Amino acid sequence: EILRHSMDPPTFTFNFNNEPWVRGRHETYLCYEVERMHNDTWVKLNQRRGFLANQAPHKHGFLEGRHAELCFLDVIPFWKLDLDQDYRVTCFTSWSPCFSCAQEMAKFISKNKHVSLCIKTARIYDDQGRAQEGLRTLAEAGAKISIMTYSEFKHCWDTFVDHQGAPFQPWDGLDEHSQDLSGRLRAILQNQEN
C-alpha cells in the first residue's frame, strides 16, 4: 500500500482534491517518471515509481535548504545519468521548487544539461515575487516545471494513488490554475508578460 500498490484514501482525494499547494509548505514530494534514452532511443514505456521528498526549511543544523528537487539533482550523479544512460525524468510535485533551486538545478541541468526534468506543480508558490524565478530558469533549462492540471492530474492521481476505486480525479479548480499557472510558466520562463 504505497505508490505502486496504493496510497491513502485521505491523501489525494482529500488533499489533492481542490486544494492547490499544501496547507503548509513542507515535506514536499515528487513522483518520478523516466524514459530510456539510448543515443536516439526513448523508452517511454510504463516507467514510473515515484521520486524523493525533501524540504528546505528546518529547525537545526540539518537545515540545508534542499527539496526533493535538489534531491533529484542528486539522483543524476548517482543515476549515472547520461555517463551511463540518459533518462527522461518527469517528476510530479504539489507545487513549484524555489529560486535557490533554480540556480542549483540550472547549473547542473541548465548550465550543463544532459537529462530530462519534468516537475509538475499544481501551483507556483506566489507569496511576494518568489518561486516564479525558480521555474523560470528551471523550466527554461534546469528543469521543465510543468503545470499540474487536469491532464497532469489524471497522471498525478494514478501517479501515487493507483485509484482505490477511482480512475481519475476531476478537481476542476486545477483547470483555472491551468490557464493561470501555465500562463505563468510562459511569463516567468522568458519574463514574458502574457
**Catalytic residue numbers?**
69
* Beta carbon nearer to Zn ion, 97 or 142: 97
Per-residue string for binding with Zn ion, 83-112, x by CB under 5 A?
A: --------------xx--x-----------
CA angle 15, 174, 135 (to 5 degrees): 95
| Min CB(154)–Zn ion separation in Å | 26
> Rounded distance, CA 128 to CA 30, Å?
24
The answer to the question of residue 67 lying near Zn ion (CB under 5 A) is yes
The cell for 157 is: 492521481
5 is in an annotated binding site: no
The answer to the question of residue 120 lying near Zn ion (CB under 5 A) is no
Q: Which residues contact 31 (CB under 8 A, 6 or more apart)?
A: 3, 48, 49, 50, 51, 91, 92, 156, 159, 160
* Beta carbon nearer to Zn ion, 31 or 101: 101
- Contact residues toward Zn ion (CB under 5 A) are 67, 97-98, 101
